[PDB]
Amino acid sequence: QVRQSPQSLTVWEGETTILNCSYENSAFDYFPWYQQFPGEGPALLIAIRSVSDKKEDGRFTIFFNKREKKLSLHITDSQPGDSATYFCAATGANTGKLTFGHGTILRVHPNIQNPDPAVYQLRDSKSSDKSVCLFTDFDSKDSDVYITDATVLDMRSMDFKSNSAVAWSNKSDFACANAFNNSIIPEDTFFPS
Amino acid sequence: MKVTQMPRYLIKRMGENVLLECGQDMSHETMYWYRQDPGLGLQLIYISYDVDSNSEGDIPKGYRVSRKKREHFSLILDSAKTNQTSVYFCASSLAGTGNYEQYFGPGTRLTVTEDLKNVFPPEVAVFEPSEAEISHTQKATLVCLATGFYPDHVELSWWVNGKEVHSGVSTDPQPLKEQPALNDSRYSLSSRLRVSATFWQNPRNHFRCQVQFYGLSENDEWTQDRAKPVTQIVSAEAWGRS
């Protein structure tokens, strides 16, 4: 068993990401981390040996603590392009194959230079009752922005990569104020008519 | 130096034979088949250490493997089950121990479905930018919604004036179930394209969101009244407006 925590993590550009791992087999002696970008296969990123307590490669650093059988990957100065799933893996002289942890999903929001939280309703270019609410800078947890009744009759999707969220409906009575928890969203959220 | 996989997308009915293929040009001795499922990690199905030297991984049940050339490694499901819906990755390394870097293919997303009548192409709609956004920011965000599709095998792109664009595009990372509580739920995906207010305001400009859907093939039988959900593109287009 190789165990990672957390299952997923959301960070801001610039912040230090810390990814935790632990292992039960004290016969593990080699610990590579694999990085998997969206829609791609995993790729070897950085590895350390049991004989060593710290491995550095630019922005990426594995600290390794043999005794508590714990290690962690640090990414200083996190970049949007670091958004990926990170797998901690382990093997020893006397363990077959390579043993992967279940991975940590990392999402890095790009920095927001001038926050403009705003909600706009957009009409379908083709004649219908359909509309979309577009929430710019909605994050200036993320999904708490949404009303998830039971009432709204909508569908919802957030884009961590552009700091935006949408919600949409086929109901012509649909209004963007009822899609969102106004108590929780950014304080200066603009709702132009 | 690359690992290749074919096909990239697959939709099969339960009980069918399925063949996944992996190539590799690095003269690597060892090859691997993994599957990747939500929450679980990379799970090893079979490892191959030399031609006809295949060894079980942790989850070999329901799978068979073929290594007749050093450059290829085949994964076979003799009778596909719905719980074999997954993303399959092959890999290779120089020799078979864990100490060697594994090079992974780009993946095959396989969906095994109880009945092909569950397969639906997407509907696509483009939403015109809000005038309130244009007034406030001098920029105009179009939104594309791809809805109602199954399986979640799509690629969305934007075409402006007949050319694919990437600049100012942000697409949802993955399709989302419309009804997360249903195994056979259909999916939606959204995307935004942001341009300047003057670019949107030019009635000469046109903006097409295109979704490539990967669906049924010629081998698949179809008797339904509705159109056969084959691999196809579905688009929606809007024109700039003074």
Author numbering:
A (entry chain A): 11 to 150, 158 to 210
B (entry chain B): 2 to 243
Question: Which sentences did the original study use to describe this structure?
Answer:
CD8+ and CD4+ T cells detect peptide antigens, presented by major histocompatibility complex (MHC; class I or class II) molecules, through αβ T-cell receptors (TcRs) on their cell surface. The extracellular region of αβ TcRs comprises an α chain and a β chain, each consisting of Ig-like variable and constant domains. Complementarity-determining loops of the variable domain are responsible for specific binding to peptide antigens upon recognition of MHC molecules.
Overall, the structure of the 1F1E8hu Cα domain maintains a global IgC-like scaffold, but reveals a piston-like conformational change; from the BC turn to the DE turn, the residue positions are completely different, with many of those normally forming strands becoming involved in interstrand loops and vice versa.
